[PDB]
Amino acid sequence: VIDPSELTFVQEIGSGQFGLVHLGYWLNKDKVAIKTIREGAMSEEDFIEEAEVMMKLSHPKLVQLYGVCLEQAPICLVFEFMEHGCLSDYLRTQRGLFAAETLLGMCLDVCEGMAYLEEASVIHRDLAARNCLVGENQVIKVSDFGMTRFVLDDQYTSSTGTKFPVKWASPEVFSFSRYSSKSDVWSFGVLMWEVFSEGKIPYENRSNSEVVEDISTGFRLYKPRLASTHVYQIMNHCWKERPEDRPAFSRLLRQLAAI
Numbered sequence: 001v002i003d004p005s006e007l008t009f010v011q012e013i014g015s016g017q018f019g020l021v022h023l024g025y026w027l028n029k030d031k032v033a034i035k036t037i038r039e040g041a042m043s044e045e046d047f048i049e050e051a052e053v054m055m056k057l058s059h060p061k062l063v064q065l066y067g068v069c070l071e072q073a074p075i076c077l078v079f080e081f082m083e084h085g086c087l088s089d090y091l092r093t094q095r096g097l098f099a100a101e102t103l104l105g106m107c108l109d110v111c112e113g114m115a116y117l118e119e120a121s122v123i124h125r126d127l128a129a130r131n132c133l134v135g136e137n138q139v140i141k142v143s144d145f146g147m148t149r150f151v152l153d154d155q156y157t158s159s160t161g162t163k164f165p166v167k168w169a170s171p172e173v174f175s176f177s178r179y180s181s182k183s184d185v186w187s188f189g190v191l192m193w194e195v196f197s198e199g200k201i202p203y204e205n206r207s208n209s210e211v212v213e214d215i216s217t218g219f220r221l222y223k224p225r226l227a228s229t230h231v232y233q234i235m236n237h238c239w240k241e242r243p244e245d246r247p248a249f250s251r252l253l254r255q256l257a258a259i
């Protein structure tokens with residue numbers, strides 16, 4: 001638990017799934033990012049349960065949750081400040097400046113984070129570039145793993161909802177809500193596409209229904225220029241119809257490191 005007096009709210013930096021994000025300071029010295037959880041956004045008591053375990057999850061390629069500020073309404077989550085924001089934004093902003101090796105390095109970072117979560121029996125559920133953050137020396141860290149379990153907006157959570165992230169969803173997820181580390185693997189493949197495409201939106205921004213149809217019939221994203229023949233076959237292995245035909249993150253890590 002972080003005491004409210006230990007935090008200083010400096011400036012609003014944006015809004016996400018659960019509401020406001022501020023740049024702040026922790027004990028008047030260290031830069032932190034503070035999520036202010038908006039009313040009706042979170043399943044609050046259910047999260048305060050899972051907060052202890054989430055905090056205990058620690059890895060250099062996961063954005064660290066430093067603590068929870070509970071002694072106030074609305075409650076706040078205190079995070080490691082990532083100096084370059086979301087990967088999705090970062091890729092688009094820096095488009096044209098990336099060497100293939102740097103882009104591969106980003107995929108490696110994410111894969112290391114996911115390998116840790118997979119090992120720890122944790123499903124992300126919404127792995128995408130928008131949910132990864134960029135820190136010192138372009139290091140990429142995975143964030144908000146498992147958080148969609150606490151989202152009250154049924155448009156996001158339900159596979160049939162209008163806000164459902166179909167573009168990163170494996171066939172068994174969008175059809176049957178069947179999550180696993182292997183469904184995160186599908187998402188990771190799409191994230192690889194995003195990285196090597198320098199932040200392009202997968203599936204020409206096609207409708208949710210059209211993507212479901214595309215994937216159901218066998219369509220797959222085409223190779224981005226900066227992705228090698230080898231990288232593209234790794235992507236395609238992530239997009240096998242059956243989750244059992246997809247590699248584990250532990251395997252992908254060996255493959256991406258071997259390059």
Ligand SMILES: COc1cc(C)c(Sc2cnc(NC(=O)c3ccc(CN[C@@H](C)C(C)(C)C)cc3)s2)cc1C(=O)N1CCN(C(C)=O)CC1
Pocket residue numbers: 011013014015016017021023033034035063079080081082083084085086130131132133143144
């Ligand atoms: C995936 O969602 C999130 C996950 C985490 C885990 C955190 S906790 C965080 C940890 N670290 C963060 N860093 C940043 O959000 C950031 C953004 C911009 C800049 C560059 N300009 C700075 C210096 C300002 C905005 C002060 C001018 C630097 C850092 S947020 C915040 C969000 C989130 O909701 N947003 C990310 C950042 N946003 C925007 C508009 O960029 C708002 C949505």
